[PDB]
Amino acid sequence: SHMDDVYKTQPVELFYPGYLESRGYRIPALETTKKGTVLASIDVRNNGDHDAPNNNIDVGIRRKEVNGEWEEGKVILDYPGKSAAIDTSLMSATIEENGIEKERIFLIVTHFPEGYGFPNTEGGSGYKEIDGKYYFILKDAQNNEYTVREDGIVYNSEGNETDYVMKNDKTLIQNGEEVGNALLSNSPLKAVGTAHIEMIYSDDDGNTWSEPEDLNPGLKKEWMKFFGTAPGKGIQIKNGEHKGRLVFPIYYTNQNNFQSSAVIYSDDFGETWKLGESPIDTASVSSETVSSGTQLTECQVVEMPNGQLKLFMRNTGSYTRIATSFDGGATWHDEVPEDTSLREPYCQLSVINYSGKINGKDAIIFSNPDASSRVNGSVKVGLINENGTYDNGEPRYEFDWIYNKTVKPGSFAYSCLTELPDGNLGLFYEGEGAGRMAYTEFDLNYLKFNA
Ligand SMILES: CC(=O)N[C@H]1[C@H]([C@H](O)[C@H](O)COC(C)=O)O[C@@](O)(C(=O)O)C[C@@H]1O
């Protein structure tokens, strides 16, 4: 029996094999809207649990409105064939329009054409810059280059018009008929086999979503191979000099296949994006050229009281790495320590801000498999203490890990926390077995309890 003042719901399954005709599901993401709706998005991995390639993977989402029930799941982003959309990240953000606070929900996801995934991705942005404009590259089977331009007219490398058009959905039209799709590995002209980040947004509290916008052009560097969403959530900076900025954690690989964490950020409410440096970038080390040492991969971000950023990162070492940014994620302090409270078995993790005070301190919630392996799902509570400053004027925040509660003793993999309107926490996690994506709720007391 749990203690008298404790809240913990028996886990339910929000996605499972067969649901929406999908054989497989992975990669939980969970965000709460300002209207108090919980969004749970997921990889609808149609052909099984395996990553890209050789998987028809789409984006699925479920909504639960405040004092409502889990509504039915929808596929909200679908690509031709076995082209994959993999690893989603949700972010609820607001903009003061008139004097009305308007809310937009952003989702980003990594996207690959048929035949491609992390293990075999090619390099590049997928675009050619010609006189300031970015143009979508197509390749023929003899590896010549074409670009997509005005009205989807396909130009060749000599710079002249072909008899091909590409529609937005990557459909290829030649002399009236549809002759293929640029994302399908059997198309006469193909997109570059490389990672993209695509974004969709929702203006109606998750009910409906935009068409995908490729974020690659002008953002992903030509030297990057993998370039991808760090699944979980993004955040909008609440306070400090960079209030209002959108912050989406990502990671990428260089020409040596070395993995570096970073964030992409927007100061114009998602209109344009910029790439921050990796915590891997110092004056000693460049994430472009690095080829040895601790890799920093998937990551999630929290904001300290004055707006300073903390990026928690899956990595090749034994414990979680934390990076600090003083400039809204543009750059990180040179020093990137482990937290030896946060054992890191090489798995995605979730970290979030908590809106209320806990023992009169501000707090974050963390979850991951606390073990050498993907077992022992544990949710921790971290109290934030100031303890000094930096040569540079800004406070030096440290983590007190007061609660550390096992919520799943056996298998536990990817998870994502969210704060509920009522002040409780949701957790959307892998590990219930058999492709089943589990959602549970609990309160702070649940976390205080010692087994
Ligand atoms: C493939 C992808 O885009 N993302 C996947 C990620 C990723 O391949 C990893 O971060 C890179 O490092 C490795 C492969 O060693 O790893 C997972 O395969 C896993 O479960 O670990 C699931 C996740 O969807």
Numbering used by the authors: 354 to 804
Text from the published report:
The genomes of most C. perfringens strains contain three separate genes encoding highly conserved GH33 CAZymes targeting sialic acid glycosidic linkages: the nonsecreted 43 kDa NanH, and the two secreted 77 kDa NanI and 129 kDa NanJ. Here, we present the structural and biochemical characterization of the GH33 catalytic domains of the three sialidases of C. perfringens and probe their substrate specificity. The catalytically active domains, which we refer to as NanHGH33, NanJGH33, and NanIGH33, displayed differential activity on various naturally occurring forms of sialic acid. We report the X-ray crystal structures of these domains in complex with relevant sialic acid variants revealing the molecular basis of how each catalytic domain accommodates different sialic acids.
NanJ is highly multimodular comprising a central GH33 domain flanked on the N terminus by family 32 and 40 CBMs and on the C-terminal side by an unknown domain, X82 cohesin, and fibronectin type III-like domains. The positions of the active site residues in the NanJGH33 Neu5,9Ac2 complex remained essentially identical to those in the NanJGH33 Neu5Ac complex, continuing to suggest a relatively rigid active site. The 9-O-Ac group was accommodated by this group being orientated up and away from the active site, rather than continuing the trajectory of the glycerol chain into the a 9-O-Ac binding pocket as in NanHGH33. In NanIGH33 and NanJGH33, the 9-O-Ac binding site is apparently blocked off by phenylalanine residues (F353 and F471 in NanIGH33 and NanJGH33, respectively). The presence of the 9-O-Ac group, however, and how it is positioned in the NanJGH33 active site appears to change the context of other acetyl groups. The conformation of the 9-O-Ac group in the NanJGH33 complex would be anticipated to clash with the conformation of a 7-O-Ac group if positioned in a manner that would allow accommodation in the NanJGH33 active site. NanJGH33 was more efficient than NanIGH33 at hydrolyzing Neu5Gc and could accommodate 7-O-Ac modification, but the latter only when 9-O-acetylation was absent.
